Amino acid sequence: VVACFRMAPLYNLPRHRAVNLFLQGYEKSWIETEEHYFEDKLIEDLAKPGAEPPEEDEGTKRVDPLH
């Protein structure tokens, strides 16, 4: 009865174990769920020929970074 019900609560646990549990929980709850969209910006930046004709080329159009 008592043993079945009263297992270790968080406050009974030592500080470092609770800290590790908090790190794992914070990770999987906040860091993974955090979403930011950068793919379109990154691809557009990578697909830009950056001042290549002004740059000394002396040849065919240099392939872009995405290429």
Binding site: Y11, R15, F22, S29
Partner: protein
């Protein structure tokens, strides 16, 4: 370090309140101590639900604010403005 210490102190105070109020209704004690009888990983996962507006986490608003400010500072340091 200090966030988990404040969380543990708040949990102890809430547990003391639940012991003071258990005698009122035995059925109340069941789902009130479901939290304290859950495994510790689940306990801290379900206490770390300040995000969104579900508000099922039994945590003080100031304790939520500390984490919400640290998370913004961390995003600023990571450059995710």
């Amino acid at each position: 370090d200090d966030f988990v210490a404040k969380l543990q102190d708040n949990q102890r105070f809430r547990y003391n309140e639940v012991m003071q109020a258990l005698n009122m209704s035995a059925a109340l004690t069941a789902r009130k101590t479901k939290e304290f009888r859950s495994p510790p990983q689940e306990q801290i996962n379900m206490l770390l639900n300040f995000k969104d507006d579900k508000s099922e986490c039994p945590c003080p608003e100031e304790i939520r604010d500390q984490l919400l400010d640290f998370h913004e500072d961390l995003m600023t340091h990571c450059g995710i403005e």
